[PDB]
Write a protein that binds this DNA or RNA. Structure first.
Length: 71
DNA sequence: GCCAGCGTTGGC
DNA sequence: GCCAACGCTGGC
């Protein structure tokens, strides 16, 4: 349960994926997933992400939780 | 019963 | 006033 962040190969150049495990409360150990644009904007849901990227690329099979396209 | 999506807010 | 961190909940 450590924070990890680096490049997401399923998104365009400069986009990054991050996992932050929750450390307390009822949801402790749960891992939230975020994405960061090249400009550093923080995304925490697929609808949010799709408003920035959904025109420039196909996101219909992108799995926000895993960060990969569903084959 | 799980979890995507997002509401809430203590601590700053 | 912001926002990381966690809870809530509608849809499945």
């Amino acid at each position: 349960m450590e924070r990890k962040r680096w490049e997401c190969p399923a998104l365009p150049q400069g986009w990054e994926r991050e996992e932050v495990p929750r450390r307390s409360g009822l949801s402790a150990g749960h891992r939230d997933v975020f994405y960061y644009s090249p400009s550093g904007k923080k995304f925490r849901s697929k609808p949010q992400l799709a408003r920035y990227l959904g025109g420039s690329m196909d996101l219909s099979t992108f799995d926000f939780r895993t960060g990969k396209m569903l084959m």
